[PDB]
Amino acid sequence: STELTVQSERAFQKQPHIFNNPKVKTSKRTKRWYKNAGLGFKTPKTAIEGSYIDKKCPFTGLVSIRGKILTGTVVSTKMHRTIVIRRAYLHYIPKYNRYEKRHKNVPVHVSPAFRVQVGDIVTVGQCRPISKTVRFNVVKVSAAAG
Amino acid sequence: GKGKPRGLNSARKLRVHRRNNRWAENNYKKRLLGTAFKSSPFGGSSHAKGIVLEKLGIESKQPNSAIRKCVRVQLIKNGKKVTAFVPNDGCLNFVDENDEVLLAGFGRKGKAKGDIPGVRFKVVKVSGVSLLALWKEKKEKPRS
Amino acid sequence: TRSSVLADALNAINNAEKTGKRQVLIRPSSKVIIKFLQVMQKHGYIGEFEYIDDHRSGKIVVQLNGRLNKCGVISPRFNVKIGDIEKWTANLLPARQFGYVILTTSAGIMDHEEARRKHVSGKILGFVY
Amino acid sequence: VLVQDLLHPTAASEARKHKLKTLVQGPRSYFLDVKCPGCLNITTVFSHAQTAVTCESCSTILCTPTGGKAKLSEGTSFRRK
Amino acid sequence: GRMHSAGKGISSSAIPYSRNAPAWFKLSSESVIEQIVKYARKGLTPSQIGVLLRDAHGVTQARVITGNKIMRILKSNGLAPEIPEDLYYLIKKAVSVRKHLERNRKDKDAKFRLILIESRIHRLARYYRTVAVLPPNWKYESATASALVN
RNA sequence: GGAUAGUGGCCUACCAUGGUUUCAACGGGUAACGGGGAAUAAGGGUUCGAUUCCGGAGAGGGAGCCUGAGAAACGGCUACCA
RNA sequence: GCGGUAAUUCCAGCUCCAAUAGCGUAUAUUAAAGUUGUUGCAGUUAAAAAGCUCGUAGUUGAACUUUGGGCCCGGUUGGCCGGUCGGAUUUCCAACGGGGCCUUUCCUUCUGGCUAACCUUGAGUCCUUGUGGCUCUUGGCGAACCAGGACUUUUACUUUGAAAAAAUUAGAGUGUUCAAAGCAGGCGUAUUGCUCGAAUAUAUUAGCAUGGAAUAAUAGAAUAGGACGUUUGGUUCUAUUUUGUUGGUUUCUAGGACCAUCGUAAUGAUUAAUAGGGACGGUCGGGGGCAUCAGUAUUCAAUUGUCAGAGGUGAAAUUCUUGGAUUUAUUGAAGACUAACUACUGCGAAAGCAUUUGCCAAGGACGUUUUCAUUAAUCAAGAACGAAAGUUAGGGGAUCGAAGAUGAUCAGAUACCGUCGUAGUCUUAACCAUAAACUAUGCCGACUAGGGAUCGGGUGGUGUUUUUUUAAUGACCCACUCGGCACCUUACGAGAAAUCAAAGUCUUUGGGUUCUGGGGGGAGUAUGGUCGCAAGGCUGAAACUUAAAGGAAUUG
């Protein structure tokens, strides 16, 4: 569950059209923009005080949350900024009248204002597809048993 | 008891077990490998036009004795040589060599009838008429 | 081992009433069993009965009276959409003027006539006639 | 039989049954109160005792553990409680 | 009946109909707690503590006389055993049978009983890692089997 | 960053080894276009659906592109192959 | 199945039967088919319980945590009701929960927006004497509805609603002349027109709003990093509104969060499953392994003693014999074996294991006012063991002994019978992985009927005996109990039946679950795969063929 420095790659990670004016004495140490996610969900305090960028985040970021809202547990965490959900559910069969246990996987974009690991029932909404698998951004988290 | 898993979630176990016990039904595997369109002499057809090669004396089974006056034909579409029965009385003499007859199944899906051994088929027409009409003298055959 | 104590208790009921005894003992219990037996009692298939709070399970001794043809469970506690309750009671009861299949409605354990009264349904537990 | 007070059975029928099939399941093991002839202290001794029972005074054995009920050593005074 | 046999026996122990007070007892609660802790610090296991308190002291059981059970009060007072004791006794039996195998190879029925004992250890230890008295991995291993018993 | 109508490994540089799977992945068959439905029907079902409608896909095989709001159009062009 | 000389089946005629402007045929899917089975099969013997356990997935899993309306009703305790020689009741009657009826029916709460209607009075006017009656609020009443919050364990389940294109389908209206159909049409005042219509149902999982909180899982608070809070500090941000306004700094309060103090508290751990795992006890058994020990027998050898046969067989012959064969005796060696005890007994997962003694570790059951507290049940892939025959090299190798030799018996005998004889038998190290591994009966569970013996453990007995004297047992007897291999009778039951205490508790059909069979051959063959030194194992069809293959039982 690792993090990084301020700037790492060959660009300078900032947000678009946010201009920390060097001439005026910035009493505050940044101009950190964010938004409210809606659907009753709360921006974490870590997001506002934080120092990541992640343009794909619903918080301090440029994508938006709409479409389906879902939950699920976390089975993989070994990517960079993405986890892998397992929406466990039951499938009916008409003929046998009996359920059958089934699952999918739906990898979502873990933002670095959210500390997740294996366990961690999360809640996560749809956010204008990010890469080939990931269409979902995590918005709320919770632990597993303790 | 009873064997089967009666569980309210056991349906994939139930359905796999059914799917794999279906093949012992003679007809589920017979369609689903594709065995009519593979190695039955016809390709799912009911009749096939054929060419007469030979006239065969197939002698009947045990509680009978008779020589059955069958014919040995070759398919057009596929090249198979196959026995065929020439039905009712005197209609062997209505067929000569290479008479492009029409073959049907025989009444039991593709097994024999009664006391011809091994034959599957029959002729219904010769070169474009019939055999009922020829046998009851109500049609005369064109000459090629 | 000990899968469904409803089929265990009804197993004893049916066996004793098959063989003509007049009462029965049942070792485990459950509040599912108590609500099964209150329904059988107030429809009138069972006389008195008595919880014995042996500290472990609570045995139950049932003063049967005859007048009972069969009890049973339906072992997956199947869901029942409220149209399919008649498909059930057709499938597994002997007529259309007696016999009670027993649901598990969210309004409680009831039988199918009370299910159509209170206009609610859910699983199925078993049946009695 | 067909009918019997399964709720209230006779004490003969009750005494002739196992520890568990009795209607309330309960023990048969009973504590004893033993004084040795040597000392005068009372010791509370399990009937089916599993250790070599001694007294805190005078270090003598009281009960040898065996198959079922514990075999007391010699004549020592015991009251069944 | 059993986990690993053809045996269907039922010898057991029936706690009497009493939540409390075989009233003729009349010793104490805290002093018999200190009795438990003294025998425990003498190097006794919870089961052996219980049977000695039964036999030589007439104690019914500690859950009755003092409210709560024995390994619980050990785990309170800080004399807690590290691995649970029934898992400990299973591992002890496993090293015994393993010693006997490495000194007597051709004893294959004893290798089968070894299979059953390693089975019990995996099942019970699986349970203890689920309810988190172990670390969640704990890595029970055949070569370090001597390390927990010696 | 380019490309695009626009998101997007769609592509490129760089940087991590990830992602899927005995709850059946990947690979094979098919006489596989799918769905609306059809047949047979006690109930539970089983087989079929090229076909009068919706959605798809193709204009001999395969790619490319002008025109145009819209086509990888073929009752358009160009290339090859048959 | 007819047809082999008088064919109720062929070929004709006569007569009839059925479907009828249609009838037959071929082939394929559907019903028949409870012959694919979830409802709903079957496995002792008909096809079919894996050799046996272990075990991951899957599937399943003991018990336990309280309920706002009333009208009618019945059921139990009960009191003023006791009449009857301690019972004998009615009902003016509370509630104890229980069955219908309309609804209490609600979302738990702040932040105030805003109050419908006021506790009224702000005084008397219109009008019947006036709390009749409004125009009105200054002291009250928010939920009749709004949005910034916090209620927040998530579901699986079920009720209701919106979607569930058109045709189709079910069906409502309608005389298309009936109708298959269509969406029409119908009435006048027919001369200057009126009008109904073209419904409804259904659709599913998946969603999406909504009520229900039983069932079924899931979270808490134990090594208190807990909630309460009016508390007491201290930290950090926080950043509105007033400072004319902007931007910066600081007083402030607000709002988080965190950390210690005292306070608040019944402070907090559900049973202990005739579930299971452990601990301890005295036992028990032909459980395994390694030693070690013994027995008689067979064969061989030496030493004798004696005289013509000795084997061997259905009767014989092969062979051995005056160089003493068989027997006798003495002694020794060699190997396997473990009889008499030997059973309707034990033990082990099974194959299997019977000499003593010792060690090595195990193990079932019993006893348990001990322990932990669901730690389980069943098992695809997977692994262990796995009789005997095999196979690879040893060391043994006596007896029996496939192949082989002969001698017999025979129409022939490369077969049974006789005499030998290698591999084997035995074992160490290594493969193999099969059997009628058969109780041809999966496994765990609960219930259903009489009995007497049995093994192991326990308990009781004014029981017996041993003797030295009662005591200590130990054995025996009586009665019970758990476990165990079986048994004997009946059928309530099951079955096609022989038969069965499980093969019962099944059409009146469902306790958890694993495999297996779907007519007979083909065929455990083909080929692909894996394992094996090899013999062969596990996986495993098709072509085509045939109306049977069969299963208990009756009579011959």
Question: How does this structure look, described?
Answer:
The structure is cut from a larger assembly and holds chains A (146 residues), B (144 residues), C (129 residues), D (81 residues) and E (150 residues). Chain A has 1 helix and 6 strands. The two termini of chain A are 18 Å apart. Chain A has one domain. In chain A, strands 2-1-5-6 form a 4-stranded antiparallel beta sheet, with no helix packed on it. Chain C folds into 2 domains: 68 residues, no CATH class; 61 residues, no CATH class. Chain C starts with a helix and ends with a strand. By secondary structure, chain C is α+β, with helices and mostly antiparallel strands. The radius of gyration of chain C is 14 Å and the shape is globular. In chain C, a hairpin with a 6-residue loop joins strand 2 and strand 3. Chain D has a 3-stranded antiparallel beta sheet, with no helix packed on it. A 3-stranded antiparallel beta sheet of chain D has the order 3-4-5, with no helix packed on it. With 150 residues, chain E is mainly alpha-helical. Chain E folds into 2 domains: 55 residues, no CATH class; 70 residues, no CATH class. In chain E, helix 1 crosses helix 4. Chain E is elongated and about 60 Å long. Chains in contact: A-B, B-C, C-D, D-E. The PDB classes it as ribosome. The entry lists the keywords Ribosome, Disome, GCN1, Translation, gaac, MBF1. The entry is titled "Structure of the yeast Gcn1 bound to a colliding stalled 80S ribosome with MBF1, A/P-tRNA and P/E-tRNA".
Q: Brief overview, please?
A:
This is part of a larger assembly, with chains A (146 residues), B (144 residues), C (129 residues), D (81 residues) and E (150 residues). Chain B is α+β, with helices and mostly antiparallel strands.
Structural class of chain C: alpha+beta
* Largest sheet geometry of chain D: 3 strands, antiparallel
Main beta-sheet annotation of chain C: 3 strands, antiparallel
Which geometry of chain C do the CA atoms define?
A: globular
Element layout with pairings:
The structure is cut from a larger assembly and holds chains A (146 residues), B (144 residues), C (129 residues), D (81 residues) and E (150 residues).
Chain A lengths: L44 H5 L16 E11 L7 E3 L1 E4 L8 E4 L15 E13 L2 E8 L5
Chain D lengths: L10 H5 L16 E4 L7 E3 L7 E2 L6 E4 L6 E2 L4 E3 L2
Antiparallel strand pairs in D: 1-2, 1-6, 3-4, 4-5
Chain E lengths: L29 H12 L4 H12 L4 H4 L4 H8 L7 H19 L4 H23 L14 H5 L1
Chain E binds 2 RNA strands through helix 2, helix 4, helix 5 and helix 6.
